[PDB]
Paper text:
The membrane-anchored SNARE (soluble N-ethylmaleimide-sensitive factor acceptor protein receptor) proteins provide the energy to drive membrane fusion in various cellular contexts, such as intracellular trafficking and exocytosis. Supercomplexes of NSF, α-SNAP, and either a syntaxin tetramer or one of two binary complexes of syntaxin—SNAP-25 reveal atomic details of SNARE processing and show how sequential ATP hydrolysis drives disassembly.
Four ɑ-SNAP molecules bind the 2:2 binary SNARE complex, with two SNAP-25 SN1 SNARE domains and two syntaxin H3 domains. This configuration locates two independent N-terminal portions of the SNAP-25 linker bearing cysteine sidechains often palmitoylated in vivo near the membrane. The 2:2 configuration is only found following NSF-mediated disassembly of the 2:1 configuration.
Residue numbers in the entry:
A (entry chain I): 17 to 40
B (entry chain C): 425 to 740
C (entry chain B): 207 to 338, 343 to 740
D (entry chain A): 212 to 318
E (entry chain G): 187 to 214
F (entry chain H): 194 to 214
Write the structure that this text describes.
Amino acid sequence: RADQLADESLESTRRMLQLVEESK
Amino acid sequence: DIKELAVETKNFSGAELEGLVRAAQSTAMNRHIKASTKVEVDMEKAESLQVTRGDFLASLENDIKPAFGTNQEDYASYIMNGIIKWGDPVTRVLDDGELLVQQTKNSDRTPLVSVLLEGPPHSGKTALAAKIAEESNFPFIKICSPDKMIGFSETAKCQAMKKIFDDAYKSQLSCVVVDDIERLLDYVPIGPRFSNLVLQALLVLLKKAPPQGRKLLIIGTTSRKDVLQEMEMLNAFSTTIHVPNIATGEQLLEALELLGNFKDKERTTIAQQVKGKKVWIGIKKLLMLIEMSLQMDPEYRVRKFLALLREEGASP
Amino acid sequence: SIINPDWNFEKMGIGGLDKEFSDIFRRAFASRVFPPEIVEQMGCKHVKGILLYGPPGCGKTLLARQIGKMLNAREPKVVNGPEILNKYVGESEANIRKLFADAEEEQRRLGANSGLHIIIFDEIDAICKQRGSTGVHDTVVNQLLSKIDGVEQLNNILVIGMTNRPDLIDEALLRPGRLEVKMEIGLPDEKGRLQILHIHTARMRGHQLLSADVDIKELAVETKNFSGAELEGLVRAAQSTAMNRHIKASTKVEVDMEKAESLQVTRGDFLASLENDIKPAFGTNQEDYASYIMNGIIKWGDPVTRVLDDGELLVQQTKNSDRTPLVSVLLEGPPHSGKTALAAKIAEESNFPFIKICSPDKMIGFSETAKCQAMKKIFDDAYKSQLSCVVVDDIERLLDYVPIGPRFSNLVLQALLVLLKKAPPQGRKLLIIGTTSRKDVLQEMEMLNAFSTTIHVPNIATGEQLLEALELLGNFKDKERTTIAQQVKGKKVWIGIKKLLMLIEMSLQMDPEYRVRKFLALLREEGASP
Amino acid sequence: DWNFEKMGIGGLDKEFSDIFRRAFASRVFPPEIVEQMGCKHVKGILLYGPPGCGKTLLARQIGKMLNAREPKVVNGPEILNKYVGESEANIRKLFADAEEEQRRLGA
Amino acid sequence: ISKQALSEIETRHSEIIKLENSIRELHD
Amino acid sequence: EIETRHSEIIKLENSIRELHD
Ligand SMILES: Nc1ncnc2c1ncn2[C@@H]1O[C@H](COP(=O)(O)OP(=O)(O)OP(=O)(O)O)[C@@H](O)[C@H]1O
Ligand SMILES: Nc1ncnc2c1ncn2[C@@H]1O[C@H](COP(=O)(O)OP(=O)(O)OP(=O)(O)O)[C@@H](O)[C@H]1O
Ligand SMILES: Nc1ncnc2c1ncn2[C@@H]1O[C@H](COP(=O)(O)OP(=O)(O)O)[C@@H](O)[C@H]1O
Ligand SMILES: Nc1ncnc2c1ncn2[C@@H]1O[C@H](COP(=O)(O)OP(=O)(O)O)[C@@H](O)[C@H]1O
């Protein structure tokens, strides 16, 4: 099940970093 | 015809008649197709397709092999050189076997009968048992031999005995052949030494009746009756038959004539030398001697044969 | 069609298997080419199982793949045989089920129109053993048998199994309803060998790189009891020899490769490789004879000629008979008389394609079961030829006899006794030769009834014979010879040849003066009578 | 003629010639004529003898001189486990590199 | 033949759905 | 992986606080 964990976690980091930079 | 097919097939399972039919159809249709290296279909010949008795007979003889029925190769691997009436005793033995099979087939109060065949070595008694079994026409016939148990332990042997007898217990009529009882027991005159477990299994296995009115027949063969009598095992068996050797020179001449060997003046000269004495030999040794004697030139064959017969014709 | 649009038998490259391919086609492929209308009018059901059994060295795998491509197969799935195994509980069953997913999906989606799926299992005997706890090997067979002819119905599958031992497979898998047809692949004959050689030499003949001196019929004749793998190895070895012949003259010195481009494999390469590179598994092996016959066979008396003639007569009788496929002979004599060497020589002079010898030496420290396994394996291997010869040496040693007691292993005795009276399959010949030194005890064990005949090897018993043996051996001089002759002729002697050689070596270590005296003294000391 | 001197192994010199003659003739001769011959290379060789007689050194020298990749050393007794057979797992990891190499680069 | 299995959990409190709603709202 | 997630959480904390200011 770790596969979808890694997938969602990469997706989360990418979106969070991007979204933070846009807000900033 | 369907009646002939139904009669001719016995003890077949539901899964086997369908396979027979499929194989017959496959052979029938394959008849039309003519292609070896390049696939090709002769559509012209496919216009009229029908199945004849030949398909069924070929499939029966070659393709399908029943698991609980009787199989023909077993009877081929034991009667190698046929049966020749060299004397009266053979007819007596065959008739006695007929009588025993008759009693077991058409009697109540006795669904289990056992007979013992005994005689000197090389007398050819193993083949006679197979012959007797072949004339019963029983749906289920089986032979159990030590030939297939090389190196087995005691437990394996007894489990083989179990499996064969249990399988036999599942038909209306059954015959079982036990060969060379002594070899099963692992006998040796020194000690003496043997396997007690197999003996107990056999002794207890000659009295268990088949459940709810099913018949059974057991034929055992051996060559050393004295040891058996010392084992109290002759009580288990219900009767006993004897197979003797050849004794008289006239019998030897009859056998020689029947075999298709030394003839003409040869025979005459041979007759001049054996008639005035007694002879004692089993047929299997006679065949071996005949074969061995035929490798010399056509000038001493009779001499070599006679010298051998003298050396081995012991205890007249 | 369900088959590829293009295919021809000759292209497949398989050589020798002609009737087997025809029968497999007729049985398992008849109904899949006959037009659908008449087939649905048939309502018959295609076969969905096939088994192949052959001895090692036939590469039936070639046949497996070649049949797979012969058809318009999609992607034959393969399993080695030990795979699909895991430590965790309930995993192999799932893996087995995963195999049929595509077939079931197509069967549900389409019907009477789905393509064929082929599965190639390797060595079915590995896992599909008799179902008795058999550990995981019992839960897997049930699932497999559960899949095949299940509560549901599949009609677009086909399963091919390969195994070398067909009598250790679960019987429940062997029914009129699954894996029905079974076929045997055996060793080829001369014609098959020729065809295989043609197949493996076509490319070399194409580029004019095969010398015109080589002949293929001769090669096919000589190679006996050979298999396809062995023959391909032979061709490769010949190529490598022809190659190495040029690695020391042209490319070694970096000189014009014109002489390197004149490379041509010749008959010499084959006839050098056929003797020192390839050892057939089912064929003769010319190293045991030289290992046993350490000092040749010198003729010191008439009995040797008689023994050799008798052995020749036995061999001819076995070869030429029809109603006596099995024959036996027993050699006996006093210790150190030269039994093993004579048996080896008579065996060598038979010219049979298969020969084997078995000695206690190759089983030291074993247990009785292992000895029985070895003996049965040897005899089973021998059963597979059309002509064979086996030698069992020092019978007394196999049984582990010792006069005190006595004691011995009864089990091996029973195994040997039973084996001595088992005929091979139909149409094949055999010949057994035994060696012993204690014929009496052999008689009390009732085993002499099995044997068909016996031969006697005597010892030397006369001074004339001893002098002739010394002369033929090539030792000592005229005066020494005369002194020995004038001394020994009076009395009688009793000694085996081997001990005589030992004694001569013993005596040949002193000074020239005392050699004869020591020889005579020892000879007298080591003397006895019947 | 190869060369085996002053590079570690010194005791065994004829053995290299013998083994090369028996084994390494296909890989030394220009590949063009070879593919014309349509022949396959040997797929393994055995070494045996008394312990501590410089067998590993010989293998490493052979590996170096053939320009092959880094040898993957392994021992016998190490590969054994009590989990109803997990040896096949141990066995299979070893041939991955060859599998992927063949898949990608082909022939 | 033998062996059984097991399983476990971990502290994750993702709630990426709610954080995604929030951040999208922030963008608009 | 987890170390990268720790770096991400640290960065996100910093960014959130300075966003607040
Ligand atoms: N009239 C006959 N009666 C018996 N056997 C015959 C007769 N004619 C030919 N034979 C042949 O004799 C051989 C009988 O050998 P068989 O093995 O049965 O001997 P045996 O003394 O019972 O020994 P064993 O217990 O080892 O089987 C068979 O080949 C059979 O074909
Ligand atoms: N003509 C010959 N006859 C017999 N042996 C010979 C002859 N010429 C040479 N020899 C030598 O005799 C020796 C035969 O020994 P072999 O092992 O056969 O004897 P053995 O009596 O069977 O002994 P063992 O009981 O130890 O097996 C071999 O060295 C063989 O080289
Ligand atoms: N009759 C044959 N003709 C050509 N090659 C063969 C033949 N039999 C075996 N081989 C060769 O032997 C090799 C391995 O065979 P293998 O499948 O291991 O034999 P088996 O199936 O008996 O175990 C194959 O690469 C094949 O080329
Ligand atoms: N012919 C040789 N020349 C130089 N050193 C050797 C030779 N044979 C063995 N050795 C040395 O002996 C040691 C053991 O050799 P090793 O390669 O382990 O042999 P093995 O593989 O038989 O164990 C190594 O350290 C090696 O340097």
